[PDB]
């Protein structure tokens, strides 16, 4: 939880961030495995869901 020990903040409790496709609400890592889904999603479920997704591999180590 957010009060655990270090300081921080945003609270999550989701493994999964449900990203909606066309209107509806599914699983991100479903989004990110059916094209067809993607491709479904409005300009603003798009540029969310790939905005989600870009926050994701904006930091590698590798």
């Given at each position: 939880?957010?009060?655990?020990?270090?300081?921080?903040?945003?609270?999550?409790?989701?493994?999964?961030?449900?990203?909606?496709?066309?209107?509806?609400?599914?699983?991100?890592?479903?989004?990110?495995?059916?094209?067809?889904?993607?491709?479904?999603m409005?300009?603003?479920?798009?540029?969310?869901?790939?905005?989600?997704?870009?926050r994701?591999?904006?930091?590698?180590?590798?």
């Amino acid at each position: 939880e957010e009060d655990e020990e270090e300081d921080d903040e945003f609270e999550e409790v989701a493994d999964d961030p449900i990203v909606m496709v066309a209107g509806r609400p599914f699983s991100y890592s479903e989004v990110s495995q059916r094209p067809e889904l993607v491709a479904q999603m409005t300009p603003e479920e798009k540029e969310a869901y790939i905005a989600m997704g870009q926050r994701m591999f904006e930091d590698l180590f590798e």
